[PDB]
Ligand binder design. Structure first.
Ligand SMILES: CNc1ncnc2[nH]cnc12
Length: 210
């Protein structure tokens, strides 16, 4: 059972702008997604301070980066608070409609695309490098779901049959054919050290057999 939804018009326009604008500094996508994971780990931590049973689904708090050259995917995994089905449908827990309107107003007044995170919609910078994004997520108060979109104005939500993750979110980037540099260990390391060196959770870069 798969359900299909239309993006609100402002989010559809934001995604088409990210996909079709000439902008060379694409590497900022990974900074924005690591920051999103850190915010979600802060949230489950705060809830656990008064109710430790919230970590019955997993006590480790971390971020993993997993490249796969055979599938041409780069995946970002966190053990944060996760998303309910309502959260996924509601623009992955963001205020994306008003955030877009601010981002547009800022771009006209001189800002550039790398400031996207200051408006609450940094998740959509994934489309600088991906042609499709799949999101797997599990919140303590709901079941495991998969969200997916290739842009084009719609997304799908379904109940996920894959491996149970316990609690958290997985962002799988199906990369554009000319953006494979972001599967290389040296390149990922460079980007993390430049943009994310003070994140307060351990970041582990997996390697491959090759
Ligand atoms: C983008 N929305 C998110 N909500 C909850 N956990 C996450 N981890 C990465 N992105 C998120």
């Amino acid at each position: 059972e798969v359900e299909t939804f239309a993006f609100q018009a402002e989010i559809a326009q934001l995604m088409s702008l990210i996909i079709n604008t000439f902008y060379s500094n694409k590497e900022i996508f990974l900074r924005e997604l690591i920051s999103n994971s850190s915010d979600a780990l802060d949230k489950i931590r705060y809830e656990s301070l008064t109710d430790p049973s919230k970590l019955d689904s997993g006590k480790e708090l971390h971020i993993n980066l997993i490249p796969n050259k055979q599938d041409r995917t780069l995946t970002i995994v966190d053990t944060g608070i996760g998303m309910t089905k309502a959260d996924l449908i509601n623009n992955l827990g963001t205020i994306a409609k008003s955030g877009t309107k601010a981002f547009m107003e800022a771009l006209q007044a001189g800002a550039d695309i790398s400031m996207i995170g200051q408006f609450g919609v940094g998740f959509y910078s994934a489309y600088l490098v991906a042609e499709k994004v799949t999101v797997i997520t599990k919140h303590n108060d709901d079941e495991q779901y998969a969200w997916e979109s290739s842009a084009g104005g719609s997304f799908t939500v379904r109940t996920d049959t894959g491996e149970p993750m316990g609690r958290g979110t997985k962002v799988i980037l199906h990369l554009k054919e000319d953006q494979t540099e972001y599967l290389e260990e040296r390149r990922i390391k460079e980007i993390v050290k430049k943009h994310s060196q003070f994140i307060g959770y351990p970041i582990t870069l997996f390697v491959e057999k090759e």
